[PDB]
Design an enzyme around this catalytic site. Structure first.
Site, short mmCIF file in Angstrom:
data_model
loop_
_atom_site.label_atom_id
_atom_site.label_comp_id
_atom_site.label_asym_id
_atom_site.label_seq_id
_atom_site.Cartn_x
_atom_site.Cartn_y
_atom_site.Cartn_z
N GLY A 152 90.54 83.85 46.61
CA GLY A 152 91.41 83.47 45.50
C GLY A 152 92.35 84.59 45.11
O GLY A 152 92.62 85.48 45.91
N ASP A 202 89.84 91.09 30.56
CA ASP A 202 90.13 89.72 31.00
C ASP A 202 88.88 89.03 31.51
O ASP A 202 88.90 88.36 32.55
CB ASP A 202 91.26 89.70 32.03
CG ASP A 202 91.82 88.30 32.29
OD1 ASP A 202 91.78 87.44 31.34
OD2 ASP A 202 92.26 88.05 33.45
#
Ligand SMILES: CC(C)c1cnn2c(NCc3ccccc3)cc(NC[C@H]3CCNC[C@@H]3O)nc12
Length: 275
Positions: free
Chosen positions: A11, A118
């Site tokens: 990804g 994050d």
């Protein structure tokens, strides 16, 4: 890349694409992140940040404009595992173990003045042995785990941003639904305000002087908190409420959360992973 056989794209990370790959000489299976001067020195400090609940960064290679980061490969992410477990839910002892482990990882990061910034289910990685690790210190930005001070334009994040994100993930593991699924910064902020109440100076001193605070925000009242995460017991709810305080200075620290009564019966179960 002649030194690695690519196997599969995994990804997109924060600064580039990730491949599962095999080292041609050693046979090691690794995750290789391809990025695209001060960052060369800073990521080298990230190699020394070694803990059981932080992804191992094996090598940092700077060459021909691109930087490659070679990481430990883990077999599944928590996003995938939560989707696979959505019919029955992740068992509470395994939720508790993963939360405790992530808090150990964050307590370590934060004591070395490293923030994640994050945290999200797709950069939490799991293995068949019951461990979970922090990772990733035309894709659409996920704002669902964003602390309110970030959304309100604070320039200097503190460690409390990671506790907020981890609180949102905790809630989502228990309820099987994302706590605050906004699709824009303002929708994200108003989803938080509708659940926790619109913050004011009583609960968050200085909120009205934040860069993006508008006096004209709607004034919603705090929802009842037993309504928000119903299957969670009162120790879990207490801990969660401390992770989701609006004032980052009031928000519980990773180290303090590890001593919370919610963890009195913590254990390390084995997940059922389908790989
Ligand atoms: C780069 C490093 C942190 C890494 C190690 N294992 N691993 C796995 N493993 C799980 C997996 C295995 C097989 C197929 C899909 C996913 C997936 C993965 N995905 C790429 C991005 C996705 C968004 N979040 C950050 C990830 O690093 N990144 C990594």
């Amino acid at each position: 890349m002649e030194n690695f056989q690519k196997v599969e794209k995994l990804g997109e990370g924060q600064y580039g694409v990730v491949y599962k790959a095999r080292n041609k000489l050693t046979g090691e299976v690794v995750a290789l992140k391809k990025i695209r001067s001060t960052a060369i020195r800073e990521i080298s400090l990230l190699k020394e940040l070694n803990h059981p609940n932080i992804i191992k960064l094996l090598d940092v290679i700077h060459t021909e404009n691109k930087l490659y980061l070679v990481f430990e490969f883990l077999h599944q992410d928590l996003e995938v595992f939560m989707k696979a477990s959505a019919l029955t839910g992740i068992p509470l002892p395994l939720i508790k173990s993963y939360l405790f482990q992530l808090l150990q990882g964050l307590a370590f990061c934060h004591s070395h003045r490293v923030l994640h910034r994050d945290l999200k289910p797709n950069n939490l990685l799991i293995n068949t042995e019951g461990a979970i690790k922090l990772a990733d210190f035309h894709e659409v930005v996920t704002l669902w785990y964003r602390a309110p001070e970030i959304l309100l334009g604070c320039k200097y994040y503190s460690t409390a941003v990671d506790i907020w994100s981890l609180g949102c993930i905790f809630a989502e593991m228990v309820t099987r639904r994302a706590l605050f699924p906004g699709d824009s910064e303002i929708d994200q902020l108003f989803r938080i305000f509708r659940t926790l109440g619109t913050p004011d100076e009583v609960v968050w001193p200085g909120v009205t002087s934040m860069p993006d605070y508008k006096p004209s925000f709607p004034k919603w009242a705090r929802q009842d908190f037993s309504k928000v995460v119903p299957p969670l017991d009162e120790d879990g709810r207490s801990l969660l409420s401390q992770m989701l305080h609006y004032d980052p200075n009031k928000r519980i620290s990773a180290k303090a959360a590890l001593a919370h009564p919610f963890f009195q019966d913590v254990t390390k179960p084995v997940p059922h992973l389908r790989l």
